[PDB]
C-alpha cells in the first residue's frame, strides 16, 4: 500500500485525464431527485445544472451518459470533491471491478454485457458509481443501460425506494446489474442450445471456431464476475459509515446472487468443453473408419500381389507342370487366404 | 572472474565530468584515467564498454571499494535485472535490447550501473548504447542535469533506457499488426514460424520487464543515503512508465496467444482430408495392379489367346471396378 497519486504517463501532459475507450457518439445527463412525496426528473447537457444537487436534502440520482467528454467528468469531480485518481479510474475502462472506500464516498466500478446473436460477440460496457452523502453519481460510456426497472420504481412509487436514502438507490442499481447478468446467462443458454443442435450432426471447422469463441467469452465472464463477488463481499462485510447498518441484508442477497452467477458460469464452461470433446470424438471415429477401410484393403490384397510376384518371376525351373495345371490351384489358395482374412476381419467386427 | 557471454572484446573508456558552470569530456583507452575521478564534487560519468577484459573491471573493483561478488555479477551477462543497496553505493542491473526487423530477432545486452558519491559507473559489453540523449543534455545544458548530483544522472540513464523500451514496443506493435493481418487471412507455412518467433520475443520481453519494474519500485520506495529525496518523484515517473510497458507487453502476449490458438484448432479436418486422399488413391489401384500381376504370371496353362482380342476384357472389367469404387466414394460425401 502507498499514498494515492495521479499516475504519470509517457507522451502525455501530467494534468490530462484520457478516456480509455471507443464510444464517442453521444452525451447527456439524467437527473432524478426524488423525495418520499414528490420527485422531479429531467435531461440536460449543461454540466452546471447538476452541481447544485450535491447538497440535496433528498436522494438524487445523476446519470452522466458519455464519458468521452472528459471536461464534464473533471468538472463534476472537482465540484463533488472526488479525488483525481478516482477520476482517472472513472475514465479508464480497461480495468476490473473494484471499490475504494474514502472518507466521504465509495467508488464502485462495474461492467455491463450485451450479447449479439450475429457472429456471437460479447461486448463490455464499464459503468461506475459514486455514493456520496446525499447523491449517487453514475457514469456510462454510451446510451443504453439496464437500470430501467429502478427508474420505473422511482417514478411510479413501487416499493420502498422513495422512503429510503441513497444507499437503497445504490443497492437497486447493483440489483439491476445482477439481473442483467442473469439475462445474459440465459442468452448464453440459448447459444449453447444452438451449438449442441449443430455440432452433433454438422461437424466442421466453423463449429470449432464457434466453440473456441464461446470458451473465450466464458473465460472473460468468469474473470469479470469473480471481482464482483469480491466487491459485494467487501460491501456488506466492511460496511462504511456511508452505508447504513440497515440494507446490509440486501447486499448479502446480491452476494448470494453473484455466487449463483459464478457457479452457473463454471457449469457453462464445463458444458462447452463437453461439446468440444464430442466433436473431437466424432472426427476421431471418422478417422477410425477411414483407417479401417485402408487397412482392410491392404490386408486383403497385398499378400495376393506378393504371391503373384513370387510366381511371376522367370527362373526357367519351377514346378509349373502340376495336376489341375497348378495355376488354378494357386488361385484357389489365394481365394482361400482372402476369404480367411475377410472372416478374421468379420470376427474382429471391422466393416 | 570470467566473461559468460560471447561478444567481442573492445575495451574503450569514456569519461564525462560535468558541473553547473562547464563540463569536461575526453575519450581514452587506459585504465588509469578513471582512477582519480573519485574526489571531484562535480558529478562524473565513467563508461567502460569492453567489459570482456576483466583486468580493467577488476582494477575498478578493488579501487572502488566493492565486493568481488558484484564484480562476478557484472561479468555475468545471463542475469535478470536486480538492484542491490550497499552501505556506500548502489548496484543496478539492466538490459538493453535491439530488434532487427529483417531477421525478427530480439537481441539483449546487459549494462550495469554503480552509483558512488559524486560519480557514476557504467559497464557495457558492445559498442553503441542509447544514452546519447543524456550525453547531449549534459553537453549543451539542455536541462537541469548539470544543476543536480549523480543520482540525477542515474535517473537519466534509467529513463533513457525506458524510452528505448518504448521504441521497441512501437516496432513490435507494427510487427504484431502485420502478423495478425497475415494470420487472420491468407495463412502460409511461414506465418506460423513468424508467430512462434514473436511469442518467444514477447516471453523474453516480459521476463526482462517485470524485474525492471521491481527494481524501480525498490528504488523509489526506500531512500538510501546515497540517493537524495529530490529524485524520488522522478523514479516514481520511471516506475509508472514501466507499468505502461508491462501492460502493453501483457496485451501483446494475449493477442499472440490468440493467433496461435486460431491456427492450432482444426487439425483433425486436415487429418481427415489426407486420409480421404490416401485411401481413395490406394483403394482403386491395389486391386488393379493385383489383376495385372495375376495376368503377368509365368504359368503356361493360362488362357491368353484371342478371346475378343484378349486384354480388352481385363481392361473393361478393370475400368468397371474402378468406376464402382469411384461411385462408392461419391457416397458418404467424400468426393
Amino acid at each position: 500500500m502507498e499514498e494515492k497519486r495521479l499516475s504519470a504517463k509517457k507522451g502525455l501532459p501530467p494534468g490530462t485525464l484520457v478516456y480509455t475507450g471507443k464510444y464517442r457518439e453521444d452525451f447527456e445527463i439524467e437527473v432524478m431527485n426524488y423525495s418520499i412525496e414528490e420527485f422531479r426528473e429531467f435531461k440536460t447537457t449543461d454540466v452546471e445544472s447538476v452541481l447544485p444537487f450535491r447538497d440535496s436534502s433528498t436522494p438524487t440520482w445523476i446519470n452522466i451518459t458519455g464519458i468521452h467528454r472528459t471536461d464534464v467528468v473533471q468538472r463534476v469531480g472537482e465540484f463533488f470533491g472526488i479525488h483525481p485518481l478516482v477520476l482517472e479510474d472513472i475514465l479508464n475502462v480497461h480495468q476490473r471491478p473494484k471499490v475504494e472506500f474514502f472518507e466521504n464516498y465509495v467508488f464502485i466500478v462495474l461492467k455491463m454485457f450485451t450479447y449479439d446473436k450475429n457472429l456471437h460477440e460479447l461486448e463490455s460496457e464499464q459503468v461506475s458509481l459514486i455514493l456520496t452523502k446525499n447523491c449517487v453519481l453514475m457514469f456510462q460510456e454510451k446510451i443504453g443501460d439496464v437500470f430501467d426497472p429502478v427508474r420505473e420504481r422511482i417514478r411510479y412509487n413501487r416499493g420502498i425506494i422513495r422512503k429510503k436514502r441513497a444507499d437503497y438507490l445504490l443497492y437497486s442499481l447493483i440489483d439491476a446489474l445482477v439481473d442483467d447478468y442473469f439475462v445474459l446467462l440465459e442468452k448464453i443458454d440459448d447459444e449453447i442450445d444452438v451449438l449442441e443442435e449443430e455440432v452433433l450432426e454438422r461437424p466442421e471447422k466453423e463449429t470449432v471456431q464457434r466453440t473456441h469463441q464461446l470458451k473465450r467469452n466464458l473465460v472473460e465472464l468468469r474473470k469479470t464476475i469473480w471481482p464482483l463477488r469480491e466487491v459485494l463481499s467487501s460491501l456488506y462485510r466492511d460496511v462504511p459509515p456511508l452505508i447504513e447498518k440497515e440494507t446490509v441484508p440486501y447486499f448479502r442477497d446480491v452476494y448470494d446472487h453473484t455466487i449463483q452467477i459464478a457457479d452457473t458460469v463454471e457449469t457453462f464452461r464445463d458444458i462447452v468443453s463437453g461439446l468440444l470433446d464430442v466433436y473431437l470424438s466424432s472426427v476421431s471415429n471418422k478417422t477410425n473408419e477411414v483407417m479401417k477401410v485402408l487397412t482392410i484393403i491392404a490386408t486383403i490384397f497385398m499378400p495376393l500381389t506378393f504371391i503373384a510376384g513370387i510366381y511371376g518371376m522367370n527362373f526357367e525351373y519351377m514346378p509349373e507342370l502340376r495336376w489341375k495345371w497348378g495355376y488354378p490351384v494357386v488361385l484357389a489358395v489365394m481365394g482361400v487366404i482372402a476369404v480367411i482374412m475377410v472372416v478374421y476381419f468379420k470376427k474382429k467386427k471391422w466393416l | 572472474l570470467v566473461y559468460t557471454g560471447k561478444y567481442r572484446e573492445d575495451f574503450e573508456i569514456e569519461v564525462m565530468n560535468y558541473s553547473i558552470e562547464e563540463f569536461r569530456e575526453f575519450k581514452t583507452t587506459d585504465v588509469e584515467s578513471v582512477l582519480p575521478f573519485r574526489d571531484s564534487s562535480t558529478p562524473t560519468w565513467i563508461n567502460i564498454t569492453g567489459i570482456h577484459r576483466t583486468d580493467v573491471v577488476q582494477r575498478v573493483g578493488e579501487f572502488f571499494g566493492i565486493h568481488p561478488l558484484v564484480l562476478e555479477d557484472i561479468l555475468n551477462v545471463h542475469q535478470r535485472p536486480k538492484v542491490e543497496f550497499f552501505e556506500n553505493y548502489v548496484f543496478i542491473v539492466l538490459k538493453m535490447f535491439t530488434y532487427d526487423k529483417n531477421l525478427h530477432e530480439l537481441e539483449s545486452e546487459q549494462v550495469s550501473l554503480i552509483l558512488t558519491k559524486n560519480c557514476v559507473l557504467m559497464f557495457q559489453e558492445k559498442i553503441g548504447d542509447v544514452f546519447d540523449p543524456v550525453r547531449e543534455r549534459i553537453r549543451y545544458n539542455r536541462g537541469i542535469i548539470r544543476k543536480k548530483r549523480a543520482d540525477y544522472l542515474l535517473y537519466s540513464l534509467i529513463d533513457a533506457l525506458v524510452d528505448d523500451y518504448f521504441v521497441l514496443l512501437e516496432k513490435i506493435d507494427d510487427e504484431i499488426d502485420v502478423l495478425e493481418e497475415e494470420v487472420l487471412e491468407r495463412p502460409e507455412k511461414e506465418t506460423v514460424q513468424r508467430t512462434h518467433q514473436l511469442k518467444r520475443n514477447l516471453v523474453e520481453l516480459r521476463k526482462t520487464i517485470w524485474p525492471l519494474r521491481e527494481v524501480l519500485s525498490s528504488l523509489y520506495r526506500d531512500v538510501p543515503p546515497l540517493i537524495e529525496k529530490e529524485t524520488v518523484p522522478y523514479f516514481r515517473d520511471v516506475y509508472d512508465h514501466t507499468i505502461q510497458i508491462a501492460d502493453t507487453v501483457e496485451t501483446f502476449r494475449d493477442i499472440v496467444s490468440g493467433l496461435l490458438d486460431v491456427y492450432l484448432s482444426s487439425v483433425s479436418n486436415k487429418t481427415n482430408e489426407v486420409m480421404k486422399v490416401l485411401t481413395i488413391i490406394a483403394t482403386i489401384f491395389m486391386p488393379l495392379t493385383f489383376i495385372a500381376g495375376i495376368y503377368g504370371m509365368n504359368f503356361e496353362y493360362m488362357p491368353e489367346l484371342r478371346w475378343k482380342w484378349g486384354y480388352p476384357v481385363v481392361l473393361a472389367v478393370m475400368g468397371v471396378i474402378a468406376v464402382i469404387m469411384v461411385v462408392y466414394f461419391k457416397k458418404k460425401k467424400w468426393l
Epitope: 507522451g11 502525455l12 501530467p14 494534468g15 484520457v18 478516456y19 | 512501437e170 506493435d173 505502461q244
Partner: antibody, heavy 128, light 107 residues
Framework: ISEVQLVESGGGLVQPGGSLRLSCAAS????????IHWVRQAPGKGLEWVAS????????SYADSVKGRFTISADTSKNTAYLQMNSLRAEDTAVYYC???????????????????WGQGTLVTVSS | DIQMTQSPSSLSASVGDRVTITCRAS??????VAWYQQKPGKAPKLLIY???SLYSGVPSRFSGSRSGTDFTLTISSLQPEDFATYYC?????????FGQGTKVEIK
C-alpha cells in the same frame, strides 16, 4: 451552453522581421481541459503543424522549422490562446488555423490526438 | 522527425467510383494516424481517427485501414460533395506532421 467555436484574429500584413501576435478566442468549452493547436498552410501548399500548448500543465511543443522564434501561451481566465511570432520571415506568408484536439487511446504506451474543431484562418502575409 | 508520403498528389475519378488514398510513414507510428479533408476556402474537417475509427458526424462511406506503416483511406462511393483535398497526419510523437495532400476532381 452554445456551440463549440474556435475564433482567431489579429493576423494581417507585416513587414519582414516584424513581430505580430495571434490570439485564438475559444467558445463553447474551457481551454484548460483541452490542448489547443496552431496549423499553418502556405498558399498552394499542404497543411503543416507549427505549435502546441497544454494549458492545464503549461507544456509546450513547437515544430523544428519555427522552434525558438514562435512562443505559445494560453491564459485560463480569458479562455484564449496566443501564438507570439517574431522575426517573421518571408517564407511564413500563409493562413493560420487554430484547432482543438482530444486524446485517444490505442495501447497503454501509445497515445494520439485528433482535432475536432478548427477556426477559419487568419491570412498572415509578409511583403516589402 | 517522422514524415508521411501521400500518393497520389492529385487524383481524378468519377462519382460512384472507389477511391484509395495511401500514405506511408518513414518510421513507426502505432496506429496514431488521422485523416482530414479540406474544401478550398474552408477549414479542414476530421474524417477518420486512430487509422480505423470513423468520426462522429461523418458519412459511413469513408473508411480507414492500417497495414504496418501503410495507412489507406477508402471511399466506398464518391459523391458530388466529396471532391476535395485529403490529408494524412501522425500523432505518435509530440511533433505531429501532415502528408502533402491528395486532391480529387472529376474525370
Amino acid at each position: 451552453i452554445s456551440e463549440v467555436q474556435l475564433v482567431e484574429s489579429g493576423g494581417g500584413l507585416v513587414q519582414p522581421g516584424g513581430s505580430l501576435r495571434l490570439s485564438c478566442a475559444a467558445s463553447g468549452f474551457n481551454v484548460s481541459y483541452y490542448s489547443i493547436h496552431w496549423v499553418r498552410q502556405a498558399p498552394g501548399k499542404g497543411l503543416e503543424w507549427v505549435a502546441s500548448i497544454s494549458s492545464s500543465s503549461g507544456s509546450t511543443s513547437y515544430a523544428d522549422s519555427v522552434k525558438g522564434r514562435f512562443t505559445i501561451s494560453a491564459d485560463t481566465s480569458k479562455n484564449t490562446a496566443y501564438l507570439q511570432m517574431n522575426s517573421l520571415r518571408a517564407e511564413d506568408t500563409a493562413v493560420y488555423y487554430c484547432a482543438r484536439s482530444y486524446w485517444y487511446y490505442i495501447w497503454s504506451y501509445s497515445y494520439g490526438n485528433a482535432m475536432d474543431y478548427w477556426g477559419q484562418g487568419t491570412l498572415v502575409t509578409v511583403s516589402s | 522527425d517522422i514524415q508521411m508520403t501521400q500518393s497520389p498528389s492529385s487524383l481524378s475519378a468519377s462519382v460512384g467510383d472507389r477511391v484509395t488514398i495511401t500514405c506511408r510513414a518513414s518510421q513507426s507510428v502505432s496506429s496514431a494516424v488521422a485523416w482530414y479533408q479540406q474544401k478550398p476556402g474552408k477549414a479542414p474537417k476530421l474524417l477518420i481517427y486512430s487509422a480505423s475509427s470513423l468520426y462522429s458526424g461523418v458519412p459511413s462511406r469513408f473508411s480507414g485501414s492500417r497495414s504496418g506503416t501503410d495507412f489507406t483511406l477508402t471511399i466506398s462511393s464518391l459523391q458530388p460533395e466529396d471532391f476535395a483535398t485529403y490529408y494524412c497526419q501522425q500523432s505518435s510523437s509530440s511533433l505531429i506532421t501532415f502528408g502533402q495532400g491528395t486532391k480529387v476532381e472529376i474525370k
